[PDB]
Amino acid sequence: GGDAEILSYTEYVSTVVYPTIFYMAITFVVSLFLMYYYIYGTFFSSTRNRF
Amino acid sequence: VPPNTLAVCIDCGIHFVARINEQLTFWPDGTQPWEKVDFKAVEGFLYKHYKYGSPLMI
Amino acid sequence: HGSNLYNRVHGNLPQLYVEQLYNTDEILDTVPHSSDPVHHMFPKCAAASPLGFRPYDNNKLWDAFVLWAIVYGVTTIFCVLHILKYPQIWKHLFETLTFQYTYQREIGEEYVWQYGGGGLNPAKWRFVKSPLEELGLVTEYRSDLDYPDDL
Amino acid sequence: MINNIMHMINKYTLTTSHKIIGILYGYMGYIAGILGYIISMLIRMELNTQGLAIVRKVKEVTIYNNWITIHGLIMLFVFIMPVGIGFYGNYLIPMLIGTSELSMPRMNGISFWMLIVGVVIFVISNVLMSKPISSGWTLYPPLSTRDADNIGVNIDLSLLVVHVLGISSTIGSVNYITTNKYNRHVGLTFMNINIYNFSIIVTSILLIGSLPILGVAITGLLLDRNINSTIYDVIGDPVLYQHLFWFFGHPEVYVIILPVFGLTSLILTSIIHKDIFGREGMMYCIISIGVVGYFVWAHHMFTVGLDIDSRSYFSIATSIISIPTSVKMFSYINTWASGRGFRGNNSSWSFFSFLICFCFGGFTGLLLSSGSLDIMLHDTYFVVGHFHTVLSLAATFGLLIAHYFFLPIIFSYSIFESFSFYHTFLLLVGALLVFYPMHLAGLSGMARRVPEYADIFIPFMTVGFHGTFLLIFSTLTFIRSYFQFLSHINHSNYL
Amino acid sequence: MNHERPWVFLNKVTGKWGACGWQPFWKATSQSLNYIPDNFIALRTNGSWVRNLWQSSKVLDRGLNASGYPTVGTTDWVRIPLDAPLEA
Amino acid sequence: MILNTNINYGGRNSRLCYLIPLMVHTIFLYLAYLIYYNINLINIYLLLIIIIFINIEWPLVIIYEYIYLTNYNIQNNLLYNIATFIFLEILLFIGFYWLYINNIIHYPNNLPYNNNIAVNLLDHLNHNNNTDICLYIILHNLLLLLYVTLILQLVHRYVQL
Amino acid sequence: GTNPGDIALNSKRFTVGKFVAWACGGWGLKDWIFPSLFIGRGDGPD
Amino acid sequence: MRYGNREIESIILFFDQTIILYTSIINALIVGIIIIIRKWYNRKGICNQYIYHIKIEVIWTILPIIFLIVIVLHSVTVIYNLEINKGTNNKYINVIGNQWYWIYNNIESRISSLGRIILVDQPLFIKANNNTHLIISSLDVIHSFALPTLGIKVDAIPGRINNISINGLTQGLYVGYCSELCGSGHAFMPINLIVY
Amino acid sequence: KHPEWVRTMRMFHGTVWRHRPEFRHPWFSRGSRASGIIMLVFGAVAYGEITFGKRLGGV
Amino acid sequence: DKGGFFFGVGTQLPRNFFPKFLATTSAIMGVTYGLVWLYNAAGPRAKTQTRKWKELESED
Amino acid sequence: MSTNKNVFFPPALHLKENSIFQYKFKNLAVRHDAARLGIILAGPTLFYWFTVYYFKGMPNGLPPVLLNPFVNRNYRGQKRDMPWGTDCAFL
């Protein structure tokens, strides 16, 4: 339609793709740490109360 | 695209002209002309084709 | 569509169509001609769509039957063959789906009920009594049915 | 009308036109899919209720075993391959490279009618005859040869069904490769043919290399049953049978999956109005998956007793195969980005379902690759969850994308989008309820191919009950939608 | 199907007009790609009734003495056909 | 005259599209019958006559299509198909060899007899030899097949040149 | 993109076509009982 | 809560590591897909040119590889950790899988009526903390001795004598199954092990 | 006078032109279709005999 | 704006389609859940699933 | 014009050799194929027959194999009904 936002290659890559990957990387690190703590209960000591 | 018209690719802005030229050939059964043939027999065959059509080599 | 035989005979090598007065169908096994009609894939659909019509009309019995056979034909043939060869399986299925068969259910008892959350966990389950007999539709459970003894 | 009847019969039996053979393959595939679905409903009704509610006797569990084996065989060899490869393969391959017919036009008809012969033999053997084959879809000896419930001839007829299906597949594969290699129109190089043709080529290469081994295995079974040899007996090598069968087994799996990738790529190009992101990357990944699938066959036998070195090697090779599929999934995700795919199209939403379900199934199957961890998950319901959330949610939804994209083109009538939305969404929700619980019932120890289970596993089967009802609703909706597709109006008045 | 061509109701005492016609309708289902619907409101016509209505709107709104047209039952409405442009 | 089409093989309808499948069906049901009742339904020679007769169709169409419809594109398609078929045959042979050498590469085995040295004069070479294998006759057969191969290769090259 | 055909023979309450649709697909009790929701405005020229 | 063995503990920890990795990847892709879909459905961010990016493609092919070598190494070490305890045993037990019942040292074990499907009349007894060797096979068809809570699942194949090493640390009764289609009574062929 | 030359020209100048080479041989087509018919009959009879258990020789 | 409340015409969804679609699918899920609950509360159940049995074998 | 002319009346070519056959054996490939055939015919074939001439009046002293022990005369009570109908080898 007439309201569709059309971006060139450079503009699209710079203003859409890269921030998306940046947010994805942040999510990756945060999820790794929070999941490891969620299961084992310790950030670096494996199972809690066991070792 | 239609056969013999001037067409324009407006993605690229290029003017082109398709054209179909039919492959009318003598029946390949060994009775092919071994030397330059004149327009008479060819005239008859072309007339018949243009009026009623000729089989396909399938 | 309509035959092209006049053109084929008046064409350019009519000797190729002499076979067409033998026991021979035009569409399948005759040399195609420069001026032949264009044959489509589903001729019924091809002829009906440009007129706005779907190929089959349910009001015509022949069309209704043809479409039923196309869509539901082999399905019902397989079902009928299975029911003929395994009458007891469908009998048991009908018994179970109609609440006629109860394995070892009693009267007035409560039974465990749990939807998800992994295997049976006593901290999540409920216990349910049969609403059918709470209302009164059920008073005793039939015993004439087949019973999986030794289970 | 004798001439008309005989002309129709000659049209649909003497044909060699790729379009007609394609529609015939599609019809047979859909019919066999419905039959497999009915048998699956029988299996589910057996599982949901307690106390052998359908068979009513422990002695008669052979009926349930026959159900599972025929469900597996019908849905693998007659539903997906005829549809995914037979239907769109024949209908589209000549068109996408600009040519009239496939090479070897007669072998195409021979392939289809071999498939029909196999279906006929199978249907007669496993319905009209008593005490049928009941040995699971992987016909492991000595259960399938030296047993008491498998003694009739119809078992041998089912093995011969496998033979004919193999013959049909080999013929089709050779034909596809040959047509794609030499009949391309001028100016089209081998690696510029569109994505679907390439995936079909690699699938055909897979089928050619493995089917003879399956033929050898089945001939071994037939010889053991008939001439009373000892290839797979107490003094034989049932493990040898397993090795051969599964050397065929995994190539069959990737043969099933790859054409779905090709079709989804093509349809995406057609509906998002944009080219494939990294088309060369996707083609190379497809060929990589094809090649790597020939070195991983023994990840289905981690508990047979393989050497420890072989266990480690096969876990490694399975991870290797896992890599390029991840590349393809990322390529799809980026392809959909920046595109203008239709916001209200069953094709679009079926693509979404395909992507999500394939990612989940691939992960769950990547857990099973580890030999050590396969100790706790072999022959439980985790494997069933895996290969049903791949087969019945990624392959089925890819075929739904193709179905809802190519119906208007083939028939020239648009699609009832609201109806299709109901069908696809209820199929999604119902199927997830059936198979997702299986995963957590596998980690809990529930074995597979059991009609009766311990009381610890009730919740999973209750959720499965819910899912089965939703599946019945969805499939009825689908069939009625298709019947409505080819039927003219039924009401009309003046407003 | 063959019904009446679209007409124009005109109420005398109130002096208010409006087009009308018979609208066929059917249960919704899939369409056909190779078919653009014909003229269904005015069957077997080149669809000139739209032009006649557009031309006649100024005549009708301005006030028309339609005593020479048939009435509709016992009401105050009369029917003007749109076969030809209305000038009066 | 005649209007010329593309270079592909157009395709003809033929009865081989179902006769070969019917032949396979006949063979398999005949085998089932022989397995069940231990007696053939029809004579084996009659069955082979039918099978031979149905397959004489291929050479006729081959001749009449090479006379009329043949070019280098078609010849290449045919030769490539031949190559694929030969590959399939090689794979079938490899599979049967797999099924053969499976229990011979695993040297350790349980044997009814003794194969330890120093208990008898002919026990060490017992498990290591299958003497009844028709050795020098197999050698003669191998010589015959070598004759055939070399003669055929020489003649093929001679005619090609 | 649809031609209704003959309006006369499809407007009846009970018809062979409607019963066939009920049996196989396309029509049902929801259409007789609730036409406002399942037939609604319908498809035609406006 | 005890573990019942060390091999099961190792397998569980490997499973947890893989679960963490896959959940992280899923969360990353979920965020990405959410952004993409939210932009798409509103008809925003359109670019028909964006059909190639060499750097991104190379990186996204490399990344799964480095995170996968770790998983492969961990899995291989877990396998060998399962298999080291062979040879340090002092008790041998032989197990035969008959048609719908088991045999331990020529003593038959069939399902009972006291328990629905789990309990057996004759269990199999092993001593706690004492390494034992199980020699498993079958007489008629293929079964599968499955005690997955101790990390044992080995097929009993006719004519093939498999040899697994079993060790117990927690005293009690472990319930297991046939875990391989064997006939009609496959679902009713349970396994009971008692560590005392 | 070469046999191959004569055979070719006969194929083009010797027989009524048939679109299908199998129809160029009138009797062989009859034989092949009869083979198809008897194979259908053979299949049906074998199916019937195997399932019912009476091999039709006693009747 | 044509078509019915739950269906549209051809490839055109009815107005406010997706809320209606989710609501109707939720209703179907609820009905099927009720059917499952009924078949579990009045269908075949073994004697080992009674409250007495499960409460006595859930202690030790 | 059409090549059919040379199909009908092909040219006749003069050769120096007494026959075409010899002309085709001045090519290295055919000579090497003939060499392979001669090698196979000369060495093995002539040698093989020589052996049956050299060992014509001597026995075969190979120790026979051991197939079936006496205690296994029943073959473990295994069904052996071949499809022919009788428990005998096709031979």
Ligand code: HEA
């Ligand atoms: C492609 C293969 C395929 C497909 C589609 C399916 C579909 C389904 N399967 Fe199954 N299944 C197998 C392959 C498949 N399956 C195999 C190989 C086995 C193992 C056999 C064995 O273990 O030996 C198996 C075993 C298996 C079991 C084993 C039970 C047991 O082992 O304990 C169960 C029970 O829950 C089950 C359930 C289902 C259900 C409920 C569906 C479906 O109802 C859910 C999806 C349904 C669909 C709707 C698909 C139906 C298709 C049509 C509707 C055609 C319409 C056209 C298209 C959309 C293209 N399957």
Ligand code: HEA
């Ligand atoms: C239908 C198609 C299909 C597909 C595509 C697959 C794909 C895979 N399958 Fe499976 N499988 C089956 C069909 C399929 N499978 C069937 C039918 C069976 C059962 C046979 C039976 O027993 O009857 C089966 C059984 C089966 C088993 C049997 C377990 C057991 O029986 O002991 C195993 C275990 O190794 C396995 C593994 C895999 C792996 C590792 C993949 C991989 O290809 C998956 C790869 C996918 C991805 C990895 C997704 C992409 C991931 C990302 C987006 C990035 C993440 C990447 C990394 C971090 C590296 N499959």
Ligand SMILES: CCCCCCCCCCCCCCCCCC(=O)OC[C@H](COP(=O)([O-])OCC[N+](C)(C)C)OC(=O)CCCCCCCCCCCCCCCCC
């Ligand atoms: C804040 C409310 C949370 C969501 C409300 C619903 C769930 C109730 C609490 C969940 C935790 C306890 C589990 C008991 C119930 C779980 C139900 C379930 O789906 O289990 C499957 C699965 C089974 O897995 P699980 O429950 O074992 O999860 C693992 C749990 N621990 C941590 C203990 C190991 O449940 C889940 O995944 C949990 C979330 C369910 C939320 C579902 C929302 C989507 C709805 C889709 C349609 C479903 C139709 C159901 C209709 C019923 C009513 C008409």
Ligand SMILES: CCCCCCCCCCCCCCCCCC(=O)OC[C@H](COP(=O)(O)OCCN)OC(=O)CCCCCCCCCCCCCCCCC
């Ligand atoms: C036209 C091409 C072929 C068509 C095949 C059609 C049939 C397909 C079925 C495939 C396999 C069938 C196997 C059944 C044959 C059993 C042979 C047999 O009994 O073998 C024993 C015999 C050697 O006997 P022996 O004890 O060594 O002799 C003592 C003194 N000499 O040893 C033998 O005779 C070994 C024979 C070779 C091994 C079989 C491999 C297939 C070759 C076909 C042989 C004939 C098949 C007969 C089948 C009848 C039904 C059609």
Ligand SMILES: [Cu+2]
């Ligand atoms: Cu695999």
Ligand SMILES: [Cu+2]
């Ligand atoms: Cu068992």
Ligand SMILES: [Cu+2]
């Ligand atoms: Cu078992």
Ligand SMILES: [Mg+2]
């Ligand atoms: Mg197993």
Ligand SMILES: [Zn+2]
């Ligand atoms: Zn251009």
